[PDB]
Amino acid sequence: KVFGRCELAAAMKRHGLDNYRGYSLGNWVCAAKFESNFNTQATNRNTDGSTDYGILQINSRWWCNDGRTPGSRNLCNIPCSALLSSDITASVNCAKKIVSDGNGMNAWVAWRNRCKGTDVQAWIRGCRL
Numbered sequence: 001k002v003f004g005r006c007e008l009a010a011a012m013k014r015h016g017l018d019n020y021r022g023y024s025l026g027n028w029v030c031a032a033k034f035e036s037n038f039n040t041q042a043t044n045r046n047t048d049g050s051t052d053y054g055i056l057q058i059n060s061r062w063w064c065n066d067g068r069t070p071g072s073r074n075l076c077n078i079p080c081s082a083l084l085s086s087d088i089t090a091s092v093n094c095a096k097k098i099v100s101d102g103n104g105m106n107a108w109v110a111w112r113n114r115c116k117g118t119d120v121q122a123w124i125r126g127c128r129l
């Protein structure tokens, strides 16, 4: 599924991400835009052999099991394919574990480079929330 901007904002709000660990909703929407272009089916392979999955591009070296990343942890205890669903619940629940691990949203390279320090409220402007 490819989400609309306000549709995703609303879905993330219902799932408890607005101000989760102090990150306002616009941060999560901005990160999704530049990680996946709001496409739940997005996958990208990394140089080390791991792969990133879903709307928030969660990596198989630490967070999920894809059966092909040797030595990986599955810290979210989920197959990586569950992260590609039109239902964002599994991605959101895993993202909450990631953002709580010490480095906040700096875990997402595109957030650090394209959202951090910008007017992220613009990503939810106009939405009925």
Ligand SMILES: [Cl-]
Binding pocket: 024, 025, 026, 027, 120, 121, 124
């Ligand atoms: Cl915001």
Ligand SMILES: [Cl-]
Binding pocket: 109, 110, 113, 114
């Ligand atoms: Cl980047």
Ligand code: NA
Binding pocket: 003, 004, 005, 006, 007, 008
């Ligand atoms: Na929309």
Ligand code: NA
Binding pocket: 060, 061, 062, 063, 064, 065, 066, 069, 072, 073, 074
């Ligand atoms: Na893994």
